[PDB]
Structure 1
Amino acid sequence: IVISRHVAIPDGELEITAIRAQGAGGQHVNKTSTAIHLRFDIRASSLPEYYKERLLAASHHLISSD
């Protein structure tokens, strides 16, 4: 449940990570306020087969080669 337009896309298929930010804002942005999400989403897990096929086919940025 991280709901899309058609598939409900179930939780468990997303690994939320927090990485130290990138900005010119002192101590807050460099260490503590990590608050940056590098969302780990993979195609192999329950995406409605055409969604899997129309994900690897049309290459795009933000997706890996795998």
Structure 2
Amino acid sequence: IVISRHVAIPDGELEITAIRAQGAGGQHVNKTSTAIHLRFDIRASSLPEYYKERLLAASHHLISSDGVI
């Protein structure tokens, strides 16, 4: 929701879905959607430049090649 003392996330630019986890767990991890899958567009979010720019000028495994985290 917040990063620095100045920039923050209004949650109106951050969609989350509840999907299933992996690995062990029994008949629970099968049905129950307990893992979180978070998507966050940067190109079209209320973030400053030098944040949008600095993300899109990076190579992190969380950042998709389409400017979405």
TM-score (norm 1): 0.76
Identity over aligned pairs, percent: 100
* Number of positions where the alignment pairs a residue of Structure 1 with one of Structure 2: 66
Residues 4 and 10 of structure 1, relative CA distance in 2, 3 Å threshold: farther
Q: TM-score by structure 2 length?
A: 0.73
Partner of 1:27: 27
Answer 1 or 2: which has greater strand percent: 2
Does 52-61 or 34-43 show the bigger shift? Answer: 34-43
User: Unpaired runs of 5+ in structure 1?
Assistant: none
Structure 2 gaps of 5+ residues are none
Partner SS, residue 54 of structure 2? helix
Q: Considering only aligned residues, what root-mean-square deviation do their CA atoms show, in Å?
A: 2.1
